[PDB]
């Protein structure tokens, strides 16, 4: 709910791919080098449909 709704509604499409935004709006231990690539991958390239593959993953 929170992660999915916030991610989608905000990113439309954040213009210049404002990375430094939603990564703060995420739970668990922060400052990681693991969760990084999972966001840079979805936003662009395969737009629209990719944003529906992200939540299901």
């Amino acid at each position: 709910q929170s992660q999915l709704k916030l991610l989608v509604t905000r990113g439309k499409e954040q213009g210049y791919l404002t990375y430094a935004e939603v990564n703060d709006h995420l739970p668990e231990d922060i400052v990681d080098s693991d969760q990084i690539e999972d966001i840079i991958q979805m936003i662009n390239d395969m737009g629209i449909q990719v944003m529906e593959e992200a939540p299901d993953a």
Binding site: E28, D29, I30, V31, D32
Partner: protein
């Protein structure tokens, strides 16, 4: 509205949450949770506006 969105309720949960935000890993304690927040804006060897 800021208080309405504040999970912490006291000094312990506050210093602990900060300790978990800064150093996410080891279990927050009493000495660690306190000394950390003190060694951020309340220690000459760890902070200085000059």
């Amino acid at each position: 509205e800021t208080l309405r969105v504040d999970p912490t309720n006291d000094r312990l949960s506050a210093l602990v949450e900060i300790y978990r935000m800064m150093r996410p890993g080891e279990p927050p304690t009493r000495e660690a949770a306190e000394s950390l927040f003190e060694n951020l804006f309340f220690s000459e060897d760890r902070y200085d506006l000059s």
